[model samples]
Target: PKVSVLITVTGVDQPGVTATLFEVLSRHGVELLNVEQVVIRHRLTLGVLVCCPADVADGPALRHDVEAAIRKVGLDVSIERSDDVPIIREPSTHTIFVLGRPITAAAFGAVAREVAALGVNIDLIRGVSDYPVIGLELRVSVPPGADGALRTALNRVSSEEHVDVAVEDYTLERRAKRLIVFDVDSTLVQGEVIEMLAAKAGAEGQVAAITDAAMRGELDFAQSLQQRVATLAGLPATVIDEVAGQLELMPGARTTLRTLRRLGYACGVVSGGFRRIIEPLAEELMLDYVAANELEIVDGTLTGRVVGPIIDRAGKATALREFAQRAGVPMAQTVAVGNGANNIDMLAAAGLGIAFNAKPALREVADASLSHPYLDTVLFLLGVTRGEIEAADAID
Candidate 1:
């Protein structure tokens, strides 16, 4: 049998504080077991667990030496001895990401209190980002049967506090995501391409009404799309180029793509919008894949028909799988993002679904929802910090 002892030190942080304590333990021939340390605003709190022979000689001398060394550094020490190492129950751990533009103390406090109320133990907390938005990562160990309750509590906190909170299982899958698929219209870009084309065709009112209904879940995407495209009949094919030229990439769209590309992500866009309008942007962004409807153009004029399989709700999900397959990334390592009701299937199909400024129908099914306008904030949810992004920028 071995003896376990826990030594804790607290005081002003300095360079050699840790080295001094370790030196004493090394001289004593103690076997280090587990150690944890943190420094905040020059204050240091460190705890070390070590094991030694049950009947070690000079035990008293070793304790005295450690105590003396800590005192010499003007720090405080507490020594706790035990007959055996404490065996902790294996916990169901989760990683919770809390994101806000300005993470107020009130919001964070409320989240903390909710975790405590549900009996979930927060094992670790760290700041993932401080700029563009505030991102905090919390590693929590949920007790048996408290998992559902913790999720519910946090969801409430997210709504009441107006912060975006996402709870994911602590697994490599979160960081292992290698492929990400996005919905183009109203998500990667500001407005719908069909609506933009409708304006040139002098059918903006009708097209807008159908689009509003489809987005609100009142009509099937495929049916509504056909109706809208039919109204674009006789429009010059040149209009597609004009609308494409005027397309406004969403805020942070370029940054998100550049950063993801730098990190080796296989990114693609699947949209219900026309392919002619989407291809130019995809090429400009150097995207890996594009799946969308192809508007049938005859003799340089809109023919009021789609030439290919319509990329609708279910088609979006299929496109996600196709992209992931081509990237050799499993479905479990893929992420999907969208904003309309049509996105519900794609969002549900991917490993992680993020609803970006979406309707409530999509939000109810997404793994995470971002109310934030900055699209790059999505990286924060993946535990990517702003510093890392800027650092890559500086180099690349």
Candidate 2:
């Protein structure tokens, strides 16, 4: 059997660098194995592996050619024999994300320690985003039994370091997410929309208690929703139109959606709030789908009753699944983002679940948690970069 030889080249990058090296290797008639290249600040590092006969006939001649080809490009090239060892078929693995404005060594150190304790080795580390925050993706070798232990440790480190971390199998489908489902209140918008309406009805004090109770799981969502809406009874229906017009989106919402759209993602809103308030906002953004509780009105006054089925916790997850299918995308290519107890089911149902400025309950179940209160920060988790987002915007 032939031994493998690894070729490495380093120098300032130029358009023809890869072409020239490949051209050289092509002349050798050697069987190529694998290659990788990266350029940073005009500096380039390229690696290629090829299987060649152990005799002098193949090794020396190929080295001489590769060395000669790189010289004209001001690059240094070297070749060495690869060590002989059987490949250890790896166990299950995961891709983990760590995002922070300033990713400090202290934070990463703690995270690294936790992963190592769980018998997971860091296989690769690369930057994913560089704008609103610094995001890194770590490809790690996870032992067969390390999944739950790793999450418990990572979550602890994340909470202590004030960094956002997400863990998922480093699967190919993660790169293909084309649909994003959102929970409107507090997740997509600034605050609870129903609370804002309650204020108009002069029942903010009572209605807010129901909202809080419902979120904590102490109250049934449909029943509590009815209780909250009943407070708005007798409020002129025109107030809904006025409040919908004045709704404020969460910070980074616009930029996040615009960039995702430019990248060909379909966005939807699944709200437990009123459809009247949410529909206008959804249309304003030209979203792909909108589902929420519909409020009944009569004689320009609030009826205080939802028209049909309620969008409770289970319903949100159901909507996410339906939305992905509606977009003609696989469930494995869907993303769910939310911030409340009601969000848990949906978050768990999607491929990547993100708890945005979430409650402790939601964070405990989420695949990733971001407390930054910036909606667009999730862009980093999607393996996008500042430069890429900007370039897409320019092209759009």
Candidate 3:
């Protein structure tokens, strides 16, 4: 059986400190297991783990050489020999993203305490995304059937700590995403756009049925949209402006867009709603791309016809591809978020699919289901931190 040892070094760092150590260790015929080095303000903390040759029974002798070799370098050393060295840890299978305005040690401890209570072991903690927010990703290993318990524990921890946190399976796809797409109505705003327009023409009672049918995938989106729009014919055109002025942005929408832009992540909106309605809001947010339907207005009166190619469910996914290609991002580096029905081709094409305040069907298809009414919570999923968001805001 091979003997195992952990060696740690601390010192005022200088060039060749690690090189010198490695040179001495190379003569020992040992198998290097793990090496990690951290330098902060000219101070160094370096750790190296190794397994000795089977013929070498004493790990402490190797430790002594490593210690004696570094005595002249203004350094300190500690070596720990393993007693029961039969196994290594499991690879990380779960991910927890933690975020706060200022991530405090106390809050982090509270979260860590909950994870321990649920019998999960955290293996890694580090920054994942920075410019948009400050966040730490904790890679963990869970015992069988402990996933649900961990989820429940985190929810309570996040609530009690009053911060944003997300738990997800640690998948390779999560790291490659560079573009984000949002469904306009309900997802970015407070209410449905068609219903908002219908109220203006006193056709709410009639158009709402059409809206419901479309949401249920019971009708062609474009056809139903066109049909419902026909109800506003002859209504004064100024009501569009009236409705535009009254639009309510979903909570955290501005902060989300602002921070994302700073992080160099392209953001776009694909909606079944009207262009004139969404464009102004897009301009206000300085969006990267905007695609939606347009209303055909003649002499400032509603023509009750859409002028452009309909941005139906499939069209949203097409727009996502277009935007992603234009931004030089692969389809695998894209994310799609929405609340309700559409073919969901948009979500499927994305590397990561998020269902935000959505129906059960969407929840079933999404990689993640979030019920929070805040858009900034999505940043947590990306391992973004609140401090990073604030820093990016300062530059703007």
Best by TM-score: 1
Kindly list the per-residue Cα lDDT of model 3 for residues 102-177, writing each as its tens digit.
6678779988998898788889887755534456789898777988877777767765775556677665665756
Tell me the spans in candidate 1 whose CA falls farther than 4 Å from its real position. Answer: 55-58, 86-92
lDDT of 1 by residue, 255-297 (tens): 8999888778999999998888999989999999999999998
TM-score of each: 0.93, 0.86, 0.67
Query: Model 3: C-alpha RMSD to truth?
Result: 6.7
Reference-based lDDT, each prediction: 0.86, 0.84, 0.78
Off by over 4 Å in 3: 1-4, 8-78, 81-122, 125-174, 394-396
- C-alpha positional error of residue 212 in candidate 2 after TM-score superposition, expressed in Å: 3.0
Model 2 regions more than 4 Å off: 1-3, 9-31, 40-44, 52-78, 83-92
Clashing pairs in 1: none
List, in order, the clash count of every candidate structure.
0, 0, 4
Give lDDT for model 1.
Answer: 0.86
